[PDB]
Amino acid sequence: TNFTISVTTEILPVSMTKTSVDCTMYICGDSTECSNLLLQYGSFCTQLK
Amino acid sequence: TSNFRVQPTESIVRFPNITNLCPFDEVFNATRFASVYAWNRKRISNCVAD
Ligand SMILES: *[C@@H]1O[C@H](CO)[C@@H](O[C@@H]2O[C@H](CO)[C@@H](O)[C@H](O)[C@H]2NC(C)=O)[C@H](O)[C@H]1NC(C)=O
Ligand SMILES: *[C@@H]1O[C@H](CO)[C@@H](O)[C@H](O)[C@H]1NC(C)=O
Numbered sequence: 001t002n003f004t005i006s007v008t009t010e011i012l013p014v015s016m017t018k019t020s021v022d023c024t025m026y027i028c029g030d031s032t033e034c035s036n037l038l039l040q041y042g043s044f045c046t047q048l049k
Numbered sequence: 050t051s052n053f054r055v056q057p058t059e060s061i062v063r064f065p066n067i068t069n070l071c072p073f074d075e076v077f078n079a080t081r082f083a084s085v086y087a088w089n090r091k092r093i094s095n096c097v098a099d
Contacts, residue, residue, distance in 0.1 A: 022052055030054070 023049065069096035 023045040028034040038044070071093050083089045 025052060
């Protein structure tokens with residue numbers, strides 16, 4: 001017989017903060033030995049970036 | 050692609066100005082040394098070592 005109108009919340013996430021890392025600096029600050037080791041490995045973390 | 054960082058320009062070193070010439074000759078240039086069954090210990094601190 002009688003109707004009412006009510007409002008309800010509904011929250012859905014969209015996205016997070018985009019994060020990017022670096023292969024060289026995360027391993028070490030300014031050491032060229034890290035670069036030599038990562039070159040003689042080859043390509044391991046370029047696909048990660 | 051790559052990273053940009055500023056390389057260092059000069060070099061600085063800073064050590065404490067204490068100069069006491071740690072007695073390495075007291076433990077090295079000594080006449081008698083203790084045996085292995087009873088070894089002695091000498092503590093060296095608060096000086097400069099060469
Ligand atoms: C349907 O329901 C609404 C509220 O759910 C009724 O509105 C209330 O009516 C009474 C008496 O008529 C008043 O004292 C209130 O102040 C009203 N509330 C309001 C305006 O928010 C309405 O009367 C109902 N209708 C029927 C036909 O039953
Ligand atoms: C070592 O000890 C001996 C005996 O006390 C002393 O003659 C000598 O000058 C000391 N130093 C060196 C470098 O031999």
